[PDB]
Amino acid sequence: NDWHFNIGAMYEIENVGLAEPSVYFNAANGPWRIALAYYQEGPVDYSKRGTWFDRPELEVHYQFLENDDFSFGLTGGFRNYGYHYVDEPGKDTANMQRWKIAPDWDVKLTDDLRFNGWLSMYKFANDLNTTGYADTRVETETGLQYTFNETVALRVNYYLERGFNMDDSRNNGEFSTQEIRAYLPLTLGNHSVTPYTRIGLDRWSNDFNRVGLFYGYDFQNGLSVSLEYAFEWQDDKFHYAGVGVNYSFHHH
Ligand SMILES: CCCCCCCCOCCOCCOCCOCCO
Ligand SMILES: CCCCCCCCOCCOCCOCCOCCO
Numbered sequence: 001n002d003w004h005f006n007i008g009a010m011y012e013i014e015n016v017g018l019a020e021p022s023v024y025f026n027a028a029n030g031p032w033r034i035a036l037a038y039y040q041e042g043p044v045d046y047s048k049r050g051t052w053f054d055r056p057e058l059e060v061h062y063q064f065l066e067n068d069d070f071s072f073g074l075t076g077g078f079r080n081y082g083y084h085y086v087d088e089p090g091k092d093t094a095n096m097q098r099w100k101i102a103p104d105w106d107v108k109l110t111d112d113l114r115f116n117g118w119l120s121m122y123k124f125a126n127d128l129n130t131t132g133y134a135d136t137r138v139e140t141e142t143g144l145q146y147t148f149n150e151t152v153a154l155r156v157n158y159y160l161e162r163g164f165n166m167d168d169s170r171n172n173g174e175f176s177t178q179e180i181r182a183y184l185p186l187t188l189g190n191h192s193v194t195p196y197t198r199i200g201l202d203r204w205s206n207d208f209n210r211v212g213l214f215y216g217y218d219f220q221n222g223l224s225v226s227l228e229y230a231f232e233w234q235d236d237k238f239h240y241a242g243v244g245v246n247y248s249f250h251h252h
Pocket of ligand 2: 197
């Protein structure tokens with residue numbers, strides 16, 4: 001079968017502040033896909049330093065079935081969160097892993113309408129007292145896709161993320177987030193434009209909205225780039241900007 005490879009890089013900025021460079025490489029053959037990525041997050045002014053962390057990751061995806069009427073796959077993943085704390089009590093480092101098992105599906109309802117989504121089951125282990133994370137988490141984004149034509153499609157999804165603790169007497173990091181996410185994927189030749197919105201339904205930890213715009217360009221020579229902006233707020237204003245480059249090449 002054909003070996004499909006991808007290599008890429010991204011640089012994101014989240015300021016209310018954070019600089020986040022990352023790279024990745026993935027290979028696919030038949031129903032299998034293996035992805036490796038490295039992500040780092042720290043203050044934009046780390047030069048002045050402060051707490052930061054890196055996030056190596058290995059994911060494997062398997063496609064059980066891929067037909068027009070029904071498609072389903074599964075991804076297994078592992079990540080380590082390497083924290084480096086600055087000017088804070090306790091040890092200055094911590095390592096917490098995240099194990100992920102997540103099915104994804106796409107089911108045809110009509111020639112124009114589809115029901116798709118994914119669901120991730122997570123386990124977090126080690127240094128959770130320092131880290132503050134709940135040891136268990138479930139997340140899901142599932143919904144409907146109405147396709148106008150090859151150029152436009154509408155997607156409206158329900159989103160849920162929640163943290164639980166298997167450890168009966170520990171309530172650290174527990175939370176619940178529910179949202180409605182709408183996207184309007186536009187494909188224009190080599191251009192890709194996807195304006196989207198996140199409508200907060202409710203969230204509690206221990207109304208929030210976001211509007212954004214994704215843009216991607218494909219040079220059709222294996223190279224593609226992307227730019228994206230997002231604005232989130234409560235009453236709490238946050239800004240997000242990101243740029244990326246991907247190079248696609250196959251085998252056989
Ligand atoms: C095969 C191509 C790899 C493409 C680069 C992706 C980056 C992969 O991870 C590098 C690991 O970064 C350093 C940390 O020490 C390793 C910890 O174990 C993490 C599991 O991947
Ligand atoms: C930038 C996105 C443009 C895409 C437009 C498609 C809009 C489609 O309809 C979305 C309708 O759903 C709205 C949100 O859910 C209701 C909110 O919850 C109620 C009270 O908080």
